[PDB]
Every structure is written in C-alpha cells, then in structure tokens.
Design a protein around this ligand. Structure first.
Ligand SMILES: Cn1c2ccccc2c2c3c(c4c5ccccc5n(CCC#N)c4c21)CNC3=O
Length: 288
C-alpha cells in the first residue's frame, strides 16, 4: 500500500524564462537558459528541453513526472514544465556536463579525493531512490551530471539497451531491482577509476551475457587498490542478495574518502579543479 505522491508540479510561462544558448541539439534540443520567476527579483540558471506533435509527449511527460517527485541533494530536480505548443521541460543547470565527459577531459587533473567523493554522492543519490522505492534502471557515468567538480547529481531515473551496464539477471530475465542498480553502480565506479574508459570494449553485446556466466568481470583499473576493486567486484556477484546495499556503499567509500591516498594511487595526486547580481542557484531557491 503505497503513500500518495503529493509532489507539486509547476507550470511556467514562456515569458518567465529565456534561452541564452543551446547545450545540445537533436531531432529535442536543450538550451542553457535563465528563469526569472514572476515578481521575485531572482534569476535562476536552467536547462530547457524542447521537442520539435510528436506524440512522444507521453515519454517526456512521464520523465517530468518522475523528476518532480524526487528531492535530494544528489538527485537532479525538475523546476517546472511549460505547456507550449511544443512542451518544454525546465530543470536545474549543471554547467560542467555529464561526469563521463568531465572525467575524460580532465583525467590528467583529477585527484583521488574527487573520485572517492563522487562515488559517495552517487551512492547517496541511489540510496535516496531506494528510499523512494524508485529503481533507476540506467545508472552510468553519462547519467551523472556535474553541478560543480565538488557536487554531482544522478539523472535519467525516469525511463539501444545498455547491456554493458546491466546486471546479469536483467540481461537474461528483464529483471530490474535496486540490487541490479548496485551492479550498474559498480560499472559506473569502474568508469570513473578508468577515467572514462569503455567497459568490455571491442566485445559484442551478445557475447557479454555468457562472459558473465563464466565468471569473467571488468579488469582492475591501475589506480585502484584491491580494497576499492574488491568493492566493485562485490557489486558484480550473480546472487543479488550477496551484492552490497547502497547504504553500505556510502559507508565504505566515506571511510576511504578520509584517507584517499591509501585507496587510490594516482601520479602526482597531491598537486592536482575549477547582470549576474540576482543570480541564485536552484538549490537555494525553494518555494513553500
Ligand atoms: C548535453 N548536455 C549538457 C552539456 C553541458 C552541460 C549541460 C548539459 C546538459 C544538461 C542536460 C541535458 C539533457 C537533458 C535531457 C536530455 C539531454 C540532455 N543533454 C544532452 C544529452 C547528451 N549528451 C543535456 C545536457 C540537462 N541539464 C544539463 O545541464
């Protein structure tokens, strides 16, 4: 017997927000933008998704339903929607992009304290979705966004298939559980420790299911101590009850984050990251 979803959905007028520049274009287009709530003397940096009638509106409006329902410091938040001829989604702006790109561009300047802190925040976000009884079903470094290098947030929980990230039981039996999300968390962590590398690269997706059944897994990254890899491997067990809980993954990585140089060995680790008067971040602007 689930409890009522009392989340508020906000409808915004197109006059309230302006599109400065486009962050990404597809046959939907995402704009960097600013949002001035009516009569508030506030300007909020936003990302606006717009669609070129498609009747894929059931898919976008479902995504918006999930984002309004969640509130967490490590989960992405939806500010409102705009019921224009082509429906617009307004979300908080993550200036530094997805964590996958961020890790690949800055590999040479990213330290071990950052890596460990990211794994903590992701596990915090995923632990929230567990509390809300929400199964992400598609965790991957591409679906974690970077508000600042110090602060990342999970995205895309509302929804080619990502076989390389999927648990084995999901591949065989289309079974999705929080414990299948822990597996995908292990691949994500692996992506960050490998500085954005591609898992099972050069391997066809059909082969991967039998590979796992043999007991083969992703290899240990070079920076990774056995303690950190050990945690990744625990995520990739066949028996989902054997894998760690997100609540345990916060704990373990938090312990490592206190002495980061003991769990990750990166060369030059110590030496190694980045009218606006009324601008406030969305996280400072909340309405009640
Ligand atoms: C490409 N991209 C960015 C590049 C640099 C900085 C931010 C983004 C960004 C953002 C979003 C999105 C977003 C939201 C829904 C669908 C696609 C989105 N993209 C681009 C997709 C890719 N890659 C976004 C995006 C949603 N909020 C974003 O910041």
């Amino acid at each position: 017997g689930e409890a009522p979803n009392q989340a508020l959905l906000r409808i915004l007028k197109e006059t309230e927000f302006k599109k400065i520049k486009v962050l990404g274009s597809g046959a939907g287009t995402v704009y960097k933008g600013l949002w001035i709530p009516e009569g508030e003397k506030v300007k909020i940096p936003v990302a606006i998704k717009e669609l070129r009638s498609p009747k894929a509106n059931k898919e976008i409006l479902d995504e918006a339903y999930v984002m309004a329902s969640v509130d967490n410091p490590h989960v992405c938040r939806l500010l409102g929607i705009c019921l224009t001829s082509t429906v617009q989604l307004i979300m908080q702006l993550m200036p530094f992009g997805c964590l996958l790109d961020y890790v690949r561009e800055h590999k040479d300047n990213i330290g071990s304290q950052y890596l460990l802190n990211w794994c903590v925040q992701i596990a915090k976000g995923m632990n929230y979705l567990e509390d809300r009884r929400l199964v992400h079903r598609d965790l991957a470094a591409r679906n974690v966004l970077v508000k600042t290098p110090q602060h990342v947030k999970i995205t895309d929980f509302g929804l080619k298939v990502p076989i390389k990230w999927m648990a084995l039981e999901s591949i065989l039996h289309r079974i999705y559980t929080h414990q299948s999300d822990v597996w995908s968390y292990g691949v994500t962590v692996w992506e960050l420790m490998t500085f954005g590398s591609k898992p099972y690269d050069g391997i066809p997706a059909s082969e991967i299911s039998s590979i796992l059944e043999k007991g083969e897994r992703l290899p240990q990254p070079p920076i990774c101590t056995i303690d950190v890899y050990m945690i990744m491997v625990k995520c990739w067990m066949i028996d989902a009850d054997s894998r760690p809980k997100f609540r345990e993954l916060i704990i373990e990585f938090s312990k490592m984050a206190r002495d980061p140089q003991r769990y990750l060995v990166i060369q030059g680790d110590e030496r190694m990251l980045p009218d606006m008067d009324d601008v406030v971040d969305a996280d400072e602007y909340l309405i009640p």
